[model samples]
Target chain A: AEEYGYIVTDQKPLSLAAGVKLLEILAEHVHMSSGSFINISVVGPALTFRIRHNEQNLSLADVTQQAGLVKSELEAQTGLQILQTGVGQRE
Target chain B: EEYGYIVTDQKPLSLAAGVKLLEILAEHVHMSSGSFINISVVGPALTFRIRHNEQNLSLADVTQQAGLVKSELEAQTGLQILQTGVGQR
Candidate 1:
């Protein structure tokens, strides 16, 4: 089974900032296992987010999805709400 | 998640536990919920989107429901969450 993260990294195209913000905003939500993967890679971004929940709880998709949720909230709070694109196959 | 397979695995993308989970999700998916419900077992093919901001919402909207779905889905499915990205601009 393709790990959900790899599936996303290869197929899901997202902006660098969007991806970084995703890691920052979503880290607080998911619960990961001791050996699970975490945030998106940045070559040298912030510390790759650490998964809090075990495998049975959070998933890569969940993080990105929740990031989208928080992103909407961040927009409301910051009044920026830019990036303006669909969830998938973004430009 | 703390899963070792977080970024690399193949075959049987979904666990067998999904069958019962679908039953629970489709029957109880809430409207104007707190967490983002990515998918439900009912559709089995489509993502379950329970979050919406079309209109203003109250704090009651954030009730632990979001956490609950993740719990229920995890307890039953034993697999990572199934997510969908759509509808939001």
Candidate 2:
């Protein structure tokens, strides 16, 4: 699930133009640098954008490594750090 | 923005670790019982499909809230939010 969004009848999915526009807005909203995301594709009714990695033999470790890259890229693009959002510490 | 997925190496490992991370998030969001938050794990990500009876929020609200959740997910697992989805009925 690299990128995901919903679609419906007479909704944003109907027109490619609409979907592309939305992605463009998101790219700007987060203020992503050019080429921040390598691949932009849609699966099912959802949108996906990847930093572009091709691990032939996928493994947990590989997935884990990519996961870090994903976060770093997101932060770089959005200027938002991943942090605890809950009000209090977990018991 | 209501919900999204962090495609990580895997799910919560330690009982008080990652699993608790997710549990805490669900609680923070006030995920009501019998709600339409179809959270799932597939491929290498934590996927979510969220919607409800009321449509008070717009797409921006969903996207923004999702960003908040993404931060929490990364805080717990150090995983990146790979995808997000908030549906409407």
Candidate 3:
């Protein structure tokens, strides 16, 4: 399954540092035996990430849901916050 | 920017999370608040206008409480609150 979404950090600098931390976690989350690619970036006001499964056997909705959970967990873990949590896939 | 919004997987789950998030915010509003008005939740976020009475609570107290709320809500809901108000409101 392929997943897409956006995340906003509560503030900057924290968001900057937290973005790096999140990238690591998300990368680990998407790694699979079949292999997968995860891309993350920082947009004007949000951190965007995507998961593309190599096997196409995963559920996009489920992947998105898990991403949402990860986003929430990070927001909670860091005093920094996410303004918006974007989930689901485009294609 | 005093206004903001949240994004989620589906409209329904976003609504659910928004409700709970606001409830937590409401508690903070009541705890160290002067007063607030025009609070509304759009999809996954809540926005509003609030005023602080320096008489009731000092700026320091209000800011500290804000930090308190931010920490608690983050731990409780995994949501973040931003400071985007205009001209100290």
Candidate 4:
């Protein structure tokens, strides 16, 4: 089966500190096996993060729910507004 | 301020590769000195965003050059480009 993962897009450009905090928040809230990986990028006006496991598929529904739960905390901790949080197949 | 971005139709490219692609495109697009370019890799795609210094750039012109660059990139990399145009706020 194809791999799937969670994506977090922010409204403003993320700083290095904010990106790390965002990752930490996801690690705490999102379910991931030991081998999972996360990638973050800050270019232009927005910040985006892609989180996925190396060998397992992540459930879109599960991730969406988890992300929903943490949305407020994520914003408060990172001090950045989230544009969207959803799931998609890994490319 | 107008913004522009390009997305790859196929699987996502590596962040390093995507950055390189954006850099190449940025070089060719030649936005005003204050313009900003950023690259993001989401699941199954890579998005390149441009924040134009509106005073110095025309949205139509920027998108046109971006399209040309996207086509050139498609040919060079053999990867399908999904879209290139004004991006949503």
Q: Each candidate's fnat, in order?
A: 0.10, 0.00, 0.00, 0.02
Per-residue lDDT tens digits for candidate 2, residues A1-91, read: 3232222223333344443443354444344542443454544333334433333433222222233335445335433333211011111
lDDT of 1 by residue, B23-64 (tens): 554345443333334533332222233344554321122212
Worst 10 residues of 4 chain A by lDDT: A33-42
Candidate 3 lDDT over residue span A1-91, tens digit each: 3435555565654455566666555546655431242576666656665546456454333443344557656656555665544343331
The DockQ-derived docking category for candidate 2 is: incorrect
Instruction: For model 3 chain B, give the 10-residue run with minimal summed lDDT.
Output: B80-89
DockQ of 2: 0.05
**What would the TM-score be for candidate 2 when compared with the true structure?**
0.33
- Greater-TM-score candidate between 1 and 4: 4
In candidate 1, stretches whose alpha carbon ends up further than 4 angstroms from where it belongs are: A1-18, A29-56, A74-91, B1-84
Candidate 4: docking tier? incorrect
iRMS per model, in Å, is: 9.3, 13.2, 13.7, 7.7
lDDT of each: 0.36, 0.39, 0.46, 0.52
Runs of candidate 3 with Cα error greater than 4 angstroms are A1-3, A13-17, A29-39, A56-60, A70-72, A76-79, A88-91, B1-89
Better of 1 and 4 by lDDT: 4
Clashes of each: 22, 4, 1, 0
TM-score of chain A of each: 0.36, 0.33, 0.53, 0.57
Higher-scoring candidate on lDDT, 1 or 3 = 3
lDDT of 3 at A52: 61
- Order the candidate numbers by TM-score, best to worst: 4, 3, 2, 1
The number of the candidate with the highest lDDT is 4
Candidate 4 shows a clash count of 0
Root-mean-square deviation of Cα positions for candidate 1 versus the true structure, in angstroms? 11.6
